Amino acid sequence: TGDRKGDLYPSSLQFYQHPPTENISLIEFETFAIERLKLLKAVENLGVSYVKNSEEYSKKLELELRKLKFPYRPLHEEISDDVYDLRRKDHISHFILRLAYCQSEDLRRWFIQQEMDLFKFRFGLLTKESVQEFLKLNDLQYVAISEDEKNMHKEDLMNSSFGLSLTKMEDTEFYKVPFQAALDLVRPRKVFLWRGFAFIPHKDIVSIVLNDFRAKLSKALALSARSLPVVQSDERLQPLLNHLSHSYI
């Protein structure tokens, strides 16, 4: 927090809910836009070439994130100025690309896919502590069942989760979610329901988070496509945004 910083960027991962309000330069605008386009294209290429759970995927994605200087790893030190800068980059670049990738349904889908992939990767790199921090800052309020209640429904939980061993189950903690959010799990009867709440194990949590993210992002893209006429009048940003998808990187 050197000169003009704040608590605007608590955590690395974010849902990109609040648009930026700063006044940036045209050079910064272009640099951020192109850099995030490179990042998303790298994500797409690695997804096509490798399996997203593969170690090669993780290594190459980390290399790309380091090369383009985007936030990908946490830091249990504090909000260092450099870190702040990186996060600011991420936050602005994302919205710029939104402006670039909301004109056509095709584009929208592409954007969403890439963003989801990136988010998943970043979640996969979060330590449990950090994970909880994130889940709190966005009012997701996932706990999380108590140990006593877990013992109370031990057998039900054991028979609910496929391929869960007794001791391994003892080593795992579940979450309580309204059944309206676990439709895809409840529908094939792969998660226990008790009193209107499903008891969802953890590897899976990213899925729920992603679902929420996707919903939000789709809505946002719709709104952006609805607010396009205000931007087309800005010639400075027209050559970029109208043609970013076809930009050599």
Partner: peptide, 12 residues
Amino acid sequence: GYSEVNLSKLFQ
């Protein structure tokens, strides 16, 4: 007026 981009005007 042609070196500053007002992000408030873009994103609302």
